[PDB]
Design an enzyme around this catalytic site. Structure first.
Site, PDB file in Angstrom:
ATOM      1  N   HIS A  51       2.935   1.069   4.203  1.00  0.00           N
ATOM      2  CA  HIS A  51       2.283  -0.111   3.645  1.00  0.00           C
ATOM      3  C   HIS A  51       2.329  -1.305   4.583  1.00  0.00           C
ATOM      4  CE1 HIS A  51       6.340  -1.381   1.905  1.00  0.00           C
ATOM      5  NE2 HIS A  51       5.876  -2.531   2.362  1.00  0.00           N
TER       6      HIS A  51
ATOM      7  N   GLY B 218      11.076  -8.423   2.802  1.00  0.00           N
ATOM      8  CA  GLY B 218      11.309  -8.149   4.207  1.00  0.00           C
ATOM      9  C   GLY B 218      12.266  -7.012   4.477  1.00  0.00           C
TER      10      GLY B 218
ATOM     11  N   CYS C   2      11.956  -3.874   3.504  1.00  0.00           N
ATOM     12  CA  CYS C   2      11.347  -2.555   3.612  1.00  0.00           C
ATOM     13  C   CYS C   2      11.539  -1.966   4.998  1.00  0.00           C
ATOM     14  CB  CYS C   2       9.869  -2.611   3.270  1.00  0.00           C
ATOM     15  SG  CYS C   2       9.701  -2.905   1.543  1.00  0.00           S
TER      16      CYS C   2
HETATM   17  C1  81L Z   1       9.228  -4.651   1.510  1.00  0.00           C
HETATM   18  O1  81L Z   1       9.839  -5.601   2.395  1.00  0.00           O
HETATM   19  C2  81L Z   1       9.301  -5.096   0.051  1.00  0.00           C
HETATM   20  C3  81L Z   1      10.744  -5.016  -0.454  1.00  0.00           C
HETATM   21  C4  81L Z   1      10.768  -5.436  -1.916  1.00  0.00           C
HETATM   22  C5  81L Z   1      10.418  -6.908  -2.107  1.00  0.00           C
HETATM   23  C6  81L Z   1      11.462  -7.452  -3.080  1.00  0.00           C
HETATM   24  N1  81L Z   1      12.501  -6.434  -3.126  1.00  0.00           N
HETATM   25  C7  81L Z   1      12.154  -5.329  -2.470  1.00  0.00           C
HETATM   26  O2  81L Z   1      12.821  -4.336  -2.317  1.00  0.00           O
HETATM   27  N2  81L Z   1       8.468  -4.220  -0.768  1.00  0.00           N
HETATM   28  C8  81L Z   1       7.287  -4.607  -1.267  1.00  0.00           C
HETATM   29  O3  81L Z   1       6.845  -5.738  -1.122  1.00  0.00           O
HETATM   30  C9  81L Z   1       6.502  -3.589  -2.059  1.00  0.00           C
HETATM   31  C10 81L Z   1       5.243  -3.146  -1.308  1.00  0.00           C
HETATM   32  C11 81L Z   1       4.381  -2.272  -2.216  1.00  0.00           C
HETATM   33  C12 81L Z   1       4.871  -0.835  -2.124  1.00  0.00           C
HETATM   34  C13 81L Z   1       3.592  -1.243  -1.410  1.00  0.00           C
HETATM   35  N3  81L Z   1       6.141  -4.122  -3.359  1.00  0.00           N
HETATM   36  C14 81L Z   1       7.077  -4.280  -4.301  1.00  0.00           C
HETATM   37  O4  81L Z   1       8.239  -3.937  -4.135  1.00  0.00           O
HETATM   38  C15 81L Z   1       6.611  -4.887  -5.599  1.00  0.00           C
HETATM   39  N4  81L Z   1       6.891  -4.003  -6.714  1.00  0.00           N
HETATM   40  C16 81L Z   1       5.880  -3.336  -7.264  1.00  0.00           C
HETATM   41  O5  81L Z   1       4.710  -3.631  -7.039  1.00  0.00           O
HETATM   42  O6  81L Z   1       6.167  -2.224  -8.163  1.00  0.00           O
HETATM   43  C17 81L Z   1       6.634  -2.416  -9.507  1.00  0.00           C
HETATM   44  C18 81L Z   1       5.609  -3.014 -10.469  1.00  0.00           C
HETATM   45  C19 81L Z   1       4.391  -3.552 -10.042  1.00  0.00           C
HETATM   46  C20 81L Z   1       3.486  -4.097 -10.951  1.00  0.00           C
HETATM   47  C21 81L Z   1       3.792  -4.109 -12.308  1.00  0.00           C
HETATM   48  C22 81L Z   1       5.000  -3.577 -12.747  1.00  0.00           C
HETATM   49  C23 81L Z   1       5.903  -3.035 -11.832  1.00  0.00           C
HETATM   50  C24 81L Z   1       7.144  -6.302  -5.840  1.00  0.00           C
HETATM   51  C25 81L Z   1       6.483  -6.895  -7.079  1.00  0.00           C
HETATM   52  C26 81L Z   1       8.654  -6.302  -6.075  1.00  0.00           C
HETATM   53  C27 81L Z   1       6.824  -7.176  -4.634  1.00  0.00           C
END
Ligand code: 81L
Ligand code: 81L
Lengths: 301, 301
Positions: free
Chosen positions: B41, B138, B140
């Site tokens: 991603h 950050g 990830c």
């Molecule tokens: C990468 O650096 C980050 C790490 C993440 C941010 C906060 N804590 C963490 O571990 N990962 C991301 O930004 C993710 C990227 C998406 C996979 C391609 N996004 C998320 O983690 C994201 N969560 C999510 O979209 O899933 C659960 C959800 C979504 C919508 C409705 C209900 C549940 C968030 C929202 C944490 C950024």
């Protein structure tokens, strides 16, 4: 999100760990520049370590740096640590400092056996100057440390286990934390207390992470809180402690004295089966800095 | 003595962490030999990552190895990870393997931001294939790992946070743990259970460390225990689990099924204000191996 009891990355310290064998004693040493620091009780044979050290020879000390021998070219004792002068400077020496920490402060421990790292974990210096570590025979000489950007502040070298299973040791200048001596005499830890400012920091971490159930309308004065603290064997909270919790209070919008009111209620009522950050006890080995560090993501190198 | 939640020394992994920037996305990558692995991603712009990746160019990927640039000479996607081919082999590549772990197993996490390590901590793969980590924006691309002697087994790369504050990610072949996708769609963790064999291992650790108050005369059959396990949302205990607890049972002289009887009583009665190894809850993120490792002092290199 999440809150873990998190240690510093241990690489910079791993590169400093060596094995020191002398007679039938093997323990760990810390190799910085051309000196190896280790507990002086590695010395041969109530012991009188100045006697014992003059009977010594440089060749009595077998220093193992991985598979490479280090030739000892001199030795001296500094309080309860030995300084073994070696002929090779450690090429992996980080920028470092020797610091003495205060009760309530935290550090990472790199537990080592035979000069080889076993694991890393975080702990706190208790008010009674012991630490609740995880140490087996052969772990002496393992060190505790903090990292600030690129600089390793060494604060602890492990020496002994006390008869409650807690641990005692020195700073890197060889001075014991607490009233302990490197003698296998009857020594007892002394009564411990809970580190109040840390418990409050941890409560702020819980709020930052969505645990809010212990929050309340109430409030209290610093003196009325400290009256409850004394009753539950908590350390007194100072205006300086209130000051350091300031940033956490700002981020969460909960005044320090309000969070104190929450803690009072938790002390008087218990948790009623609820948990806070995965614990059923009030956790006191996270400092305000640890919380900010973990909930803002500070890195190191 | 003592029992800490202990991570592996992180040095070997720290030397592999790089920063990968692509568009306005920065995250971490894992640099082994001449390949950098990172979450796919990071790709520009319900997403269709095969579309998105063909629009890409090697020069779109900015790989930071400390202060040294790494030239990307090729890229490919493997399930949910990207493999960035670079022109320099990492001189610090440890002996390593890519392994997929099982729910209930533990690993160390080196939490990183901008390619720089922030901290190390231990956790377990939950039965519902999430982990209870500590991860901020950050993070990830941070990895989880175990070390066996000198070999790093990578098992986890971090991808996302679910709306209970728990975390989901992939193995290093890019296959998610659990029924999760790298889409910011509504996804929920699913009901978790307690890892029974781990709780029993931890009870053995407590006995090895002098906590004995929960021990009892009683005993029980594997089926009568599993009837109580199901009631308290504990995973069933198998004869294989009984077998793996064998060494701990031998060391302590407490039969596995006797320790099960203790756990039954703890489940039905609670702890009555007592603690076990400093916890007021039954801890389930120590495996039998973790306990043996910590109470026998196995090292690594
Ligand atoms: C990468 O650096 C980050 C790490 C993440 C941010 C906060 N804590 C963490 O571990 N990962 C991301 O930004 C993710 C990227 C998406 C996979 C391609 N996004 C998320 O983690 C994201 N969560 C999510 O979209 O899933 C659960 C959800 C979504 C919508 C409705 C209900 C549940 C968030 C929202 C944490 C950024
Ligand atoms: C160094 O590798 C070991 C590490 C120690 C062993 C088990 N867990 C540990 O952390 N340290 C030592 O062997 C110590 C050396 C003595 C300082 C010179 N000895 C002990 O830790 C020792 N404890 C002790 O003697 O003090 C408490 C005491 C003694 C007598 C009566 C009451 C209380 C033990 C007994 C643990 C080896």
């Amino acid at each position: 999100s999440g809150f873990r009891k998190m240690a510093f990355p241990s690489g910079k310290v791993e590169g400093c760990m060596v094995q020191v064998t002398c007679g039938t004693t093997t323990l760990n040493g810390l190799w910085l520049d051309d000196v190896v620091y280790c507990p002086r009780h590695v010395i041969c044979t109530n012991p009188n370590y100045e006697d014992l050290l003059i009977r010594k020879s440089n060749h009595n000390f077998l220093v193992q740096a991985g598979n490479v021998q280090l030739r000892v070219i001199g030795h001296s004792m500094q309080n309860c640590v030995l300084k073994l002068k070696v002929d090779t400077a450690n090429p992996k020496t980080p920028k470092y400092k020797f610091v003495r920490i205060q009760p309530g402060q935290t550090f990472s421990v790199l537990a080592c056996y035979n000069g080889s790292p076993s694991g890393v974990y975080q702990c706190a210096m208790r008010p009674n100057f012991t630490i609740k570590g995880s140490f087996l025979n052969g772990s002496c000489g393992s060190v505790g440390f903090n990292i600030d950007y690129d600089c390793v502040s060494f604060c602890y070298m492990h020496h002994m286990e006390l008869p409650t299973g807690v641990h005692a040791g020195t700073d890197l200048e060889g001075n014991f934390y607490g009233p302990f001596v490197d003698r296998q005499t009857a020594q007892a830890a002394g009564t411990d207390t809970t580190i109040t400012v840390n418990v409050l920091a941890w409560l702020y971490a819980a709020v930052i992470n969505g645990d809010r159930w212990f929050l309340n309308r109430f409030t209290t004065t610093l003196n009325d809180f400290n009256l409850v603290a004394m009753k539950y064997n908590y350390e007194p909270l100072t205006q300086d402690h209130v000051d350091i919790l300031g940033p956490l209070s700002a981020q969460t919008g909960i005044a320090v004295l309000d969070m104190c009111a929450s803690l009072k209620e938790l002390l008087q009522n218990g948790m009623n089966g609820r948990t806070i950050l995965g614990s059923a006890l009030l956790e006191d080995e996270f400092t305000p800095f640890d919380v900010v560090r973990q909930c803002s993501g500070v890195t190191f190198q």
